[PDB]
Amino acid sequence: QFPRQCATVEALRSGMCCPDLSPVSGPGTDRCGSSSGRGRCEAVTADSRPHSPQYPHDGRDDREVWPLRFFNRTCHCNGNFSGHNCGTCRPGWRGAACDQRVLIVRRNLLDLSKEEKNHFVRALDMAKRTTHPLFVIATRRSEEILGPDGNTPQFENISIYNYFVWTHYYSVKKTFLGVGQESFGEVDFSHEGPAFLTWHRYHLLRLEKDMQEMLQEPSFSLPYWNFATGKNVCDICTDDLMGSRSNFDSTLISPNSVFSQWRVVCDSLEDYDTLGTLCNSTEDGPIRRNPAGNVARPMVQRLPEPQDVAQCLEVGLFDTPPFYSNSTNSFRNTVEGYSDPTGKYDPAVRSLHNLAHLFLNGTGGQTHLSPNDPIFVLLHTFTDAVFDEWLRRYNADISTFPLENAPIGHNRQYNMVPFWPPVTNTEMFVTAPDNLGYTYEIQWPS
């Protein structure tokens, strides 16, 4: 979403989000750090290729051809510089010149020391309470983005972790067609399509970076949850970690965990989908979680088995037509969880990543809300570890990642919605240790 210095009237009118970095000659004189060698303001590269016919409403949704309905000029940073104003470094690099390498290690959460486990829980909680220093979120669609008087931009501050909840919501929300019309929901810019793995990769990378800066700890890393144990229970749902079950309400988190204090954002879909607004920064209910508790649906009362991970890594094509939740022999669809681990599509099956979400039988199993449960972070670093192992094992073969006719948002060169600056699925389709500055301490079944 957008840097707060682009959420102004002047920026939104000009169509340009190219903020200053260190301007000594007055405003506008160091856009993108161009006085240094760090970058320049330039025209946005945005995918214009066709999408699947599932989405018939071309012209109605601000997420189409992202980010052109808000900005047509962005910062392009030179070399290994990066950031909205080119004031920081590409992933895996540090220093004033972005020339010193760093490689952080994402570890199994259960292998951390007692001091590390406590450091991670408190870091998450500080992120839930700390205002994001850079990004503000929209509360209205672009038509209304500048307010009632046309001079009051409809952006709100939001916390580091709630921003993480919001960008996921914005990517899955229904297309609003107008008051009294039923909003269109056969659309998803981050799921049920080839961009699932790369979208959630960037999502995690953005949170890890924000928390490194929040903590002033450059080597801080996001741990993962090996949910592929076949267990009856949530082995990270304990009060030194993500919270055990409350003894007073089986759907709430134990009051002896900080996460019982969290209040969720974006749970008011009936307001958003009928009035045409967007999720804002006002929190509401608490986290609901009830592992293995979906008695109406026995298939989601047990986690994926270890062999499910080994089987899905035997699927050699990243994705297969029609590049959707009913693709077969698609690695992306297998690990996302709409196929069984071998690749066989079945409308009734839910495996791996999907199975882990629904196992939680609560907030974590609802697409617009699930990042509100912080188990999301660890569920997705593990899903990303499977993806990273696939990228090594099959030499990052992007050839099946379609350039066109994928569901809207999922063309290979689409800018993943709504990340800023524009970032394509291709930029994330790389083995992480060599290219993104992190690796997983993990071993795979065989």
Ligand X SMILES: *[C@@H]1O[C@H](CO[C@@H]2O[C@@H](C)[C@@H](O)[C@@H](O)[C@@H]2O)[C@@H](O[C@@H]2O[C@H](CO)[C@@H](O)[C@H](O)[C@H]2NC(C)=O)[C@H](O)[C@H]1NC(C)=O
Ligand Y SMILES: *[C@@H]1O[C@H](CO)[C@@H](O[C@@H]2O[C@H](CO)[C@@H](O)[C@H](O)[C@H]2NC(C)=O)[C@H](O)[C@H]1NC(C)=O
Ligand Z SMILES: *[C@@H]1O[C@H](CO[C@@H]2O[C@@H](C)[C@@H](O)[C@@H](O)[C@@H]2O)[C@@H](O)[C@H](O)[C@H]1NC(C)=O
Residues that bind ligand X (CB under 6 A): 14-15, 69-70, 72
Query: Is 368 within any annotated ligand binding site?
Result: no
Can the peptide bond before residue 133 be classed as cis, meaning omega within 30 degrees of 0? no
Query: Is 84 within any annotated ligand binding site?
Result: no
Q: Rounded to whole angstroms, how far apart are CA atoms 84 and 32?
A: 7
Q: Which of residues 75-114 bind Zn ion (CB under 5 A)?
A: 76
- The verdict on 4 binding ligand Z (CB under 6 A) reads yes
Q: Rounded to whole angstroms, how far apart are CA atoms 412 and 49?
A: 10
- Looking at the Cβ atoms of 7 and 379, the one nearer to ligand Z is 7
208 three-class SS: helix
Least gap, CB of 275 to ligand Z (angstroms): 21
Least gap, CB of 14 to ligand X (angstroms): 6
Determine phi and psi for 380, rounding to 5 degrees: -90, -25
Choose, by CB under 6 A, the member of 23, 255, 276, 322 that binds ligand Y.
Answer: 322
Per-residue DSSP letters for 246-294? -SS-TTSB-TTSGGGG-B-SS--HHHHHHH-B---S---SB----TT--
Q: Which of residues 103-162 bind ligand Y (CB under 6 A)?
A: 139
Q: Rounded to whole angstroms, how far apart are CA atoms 61 and 372?
A: 25
- Looking at the Cβ atoms of 76 and 353, the one nearer to ligand X is 76
Residues β-bridged to residue 156: 137
- Looking at the Cβ atoms of 62 and 273, the one nearer to ligand X is 62
Local structure of residue 73 (DSSP, 8 states): E
Residue nearest Zn ion, Cβ-based: 76
179 interface partner picked from Zn ion, ligand Z, ligand Y, none, CB below 5 to 8 A per type: none
Applying CB under 6 A, the span of 80-88, 289-297, 384-392, 403-411 interacting with ligand Y comes to 289-297
Q: Measured between alpha carbons, how far is residue 143 from residues 171, 257, 408 in Å?
A: 18, 42, 21
- The verdict on 166 binding ligand Z (CB under 6 A) reads no
- The verdict on 348 binding ligand Y (CB under 6 A) reads no
Least gap, CB of 166 to ligand Z (angstroms): 14
Local structure of residue 61 (DSSP, 8 states): -
Please give the helix or strand (H or E) that residue 93 lies within, else none. Answer: strand 93-94
Q: Which of residues 235-264 bind ligand Y (CB under 6 A)?
A: none
- The verdict on 133 binding ligand Z (CB under 6 A) reads yes
Residues β-bridged to residue 135: 3
Applying CB under 6 A, the span of 46-54, 154-162, 178-186, 291-299 interacting with ligand Z comes to 154-162
Least gap, CB of 364 to ligand Y (angstroms): 8
Strands (DSSP E) contained in 11-68 are: 39-43
Q: Which of residues 5-24 bind ligand Z (CB under 6 A)?
A: 7
- The verdict on 58 binding ligand Y (CB under 6 A) reads no
268 interface partner picked from ligand X, ligand Z, Zn ion, none, CB below 5 to 8 A per type: none
Query: Is 191 within any annotated ligand binding site?
Result: yes
- The verdict on 213 binding ligand Z (CB under 6 A) reads no
Which tokens belong to 423? 């970032």
157 interface partner picked from Zn ion, ligand Z, ligand Y, none, CB below 5 to 8 A per type: ligand Z
- Looking at the Cβ atoms of 44 and 160, the one nearer to ligand X is 44
- The verdict on 282 binding ligand Y (CB under 6 A) reads yes
- Looking at the Cβ atoms of 18 and 313, the one nearer to Zn ion is 18
- The verdict on 268 binding ligand Y (CB under 6 A) reads yes
- The verdict on 51 binding Zn ion (CB under 5 A) reads no
Per-residue DSSP letters for 358-378? HHT-SGGG-TTTGGGSTHHHH
C-alpha dihedral (417, 419, 422, 424), degrees to nearest 10: -60
- Looking at the Cβ atoms of 125 and 283, the one nearer to ligand Y is 283
Which tokens belong to 233? 């229970």
Q: Among residues 167, 158, 166, 156, which one has the least CA distance to residue 129? A: 158
| 270 close to 173: Cβ distance less than 8 angstroms | no
Per-residue DSSP letters for 128-177? HHSBPSSEEEESB-GGGTT-SSSSS--EE--BHHHHHHHHHHHHHPPBP-
Query: Is 168 within any annotated ligand binding site?
Result: yes
| 72 close to 41: Cβ distance less than 8 angstroms | no
C-alpha dihedral (285, 291, 293, 298), degrees to nearest 10: 130
| 84 close to 421: Cβ distance less than 8 angstroms | yes
Q: Rounded to whole angstroms, how far apart are CA atoms 92 and 308?
A: 31
72 interface partner picked from ligand X, Zn ion, ligand Z, none, CB below 5 to 8 A per type: ligand X
Q: Which residues bind Zn ion (CB under 5 A)?
A: 42, 76
Q: Which residues bind ligand Y (CB under 6 A)?
A: 53-54, 139, 268, 271, 277, 280, 282, 284, 293-296, 322, 324, 326, 361-362, 365-366
Q: Which residues bind ligand Z (CB under 6 A)?
A: 4, 7, 131, 133, 136, 155-157
Question: Where is the binding site for Zn(2+), in residues?
Answer: 168, 191, 200, 353, 357, 380
Question: Where is the binding site, in residues?
Answer: 168, 191, 200, 353, 357, 380
